[PDB]
């Protein structure tokens, strides 16, 4: 630990991950949540690009602070270190991705069918391993943990079709 020292920094990525997830789920200013609807459109293979409006994040922060709840400065953290927050947003989106309501109809892009095949295959592997370990008869949370540790899935990096981009703050609002 002496070769690679450590530094404490004001940023806490776990709290910011929670803030990102909450912002994605519960932003309504622009009926339903804006980004949830965008993710639904992505799932139906309509939109290939998710545009994270930083003005939305700023308004979310202002709403949270105005009501008194403490919300960390997500916009400033994004501006200071943008590269990491790309992957943070990408993983938060990948967790909250809904399921398609319109299946493959022989006219879908080959990328989409390959992604669907990979997703179904890794789900099948996970379920099969769960069934085997359950049948071994040695809570389902521990079973899920052991099967996800013991299986080699297609990583989530290879099952996402959308692209992630950030829109800078409008000068007039800021």
């Amino acid at each position: 630990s002496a070769a690679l020292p450590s530094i404490q920094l004001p940023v806490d990525y776990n709290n910011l991950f929670n803030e990102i997830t909450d912002f994605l789920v519960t932003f309504k200013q622009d009926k339903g949540p804006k980004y949830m609807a965008m993710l639904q459109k992505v799932a139906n293979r309509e939109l290939n690009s998710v545009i994270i409006d930083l003005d939305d994040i700023l308004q979310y922060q202002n709403e949270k602070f105005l009501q008194g709840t403490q919300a960390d400065d997500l916009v400033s953290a994004i501006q200071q270190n943008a590269n990491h927050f790309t992957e943070l947003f990408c993983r938060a989106i990948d967790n909250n991705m809904p399921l398609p309501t319109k299946e493959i109809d022989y006219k879908d892009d080959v990328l989409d069918v390959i992604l669907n095949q990979r997703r179904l295959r890794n789900e099948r592997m996970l379920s099969d391993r769960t069934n085997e370990i359950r049948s071994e008869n040695l809570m389902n949370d521990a079973l899920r943990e052991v099967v996800e540790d013991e299986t080699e899935l297609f990583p989530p990096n290879l099952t996402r079709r959308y692209f992630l981009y950030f829109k800078p703050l409008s000068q007039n609002c800021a």
Partner: peptide
């Protein structure tokens, strides 16, 4: 052993050693 420990955790392990006890003919 890993499987059993994780399963029974509900209310890392080193490489286990095998001990072989036999009753066969002794040279």
């Amino acid at each position: 052993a890993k499987r059993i420990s994780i399963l029974s955790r509900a209310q890392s392990l080193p490489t286990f050693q095998l001990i072989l006890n036999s009753n066969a003919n002794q040279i």
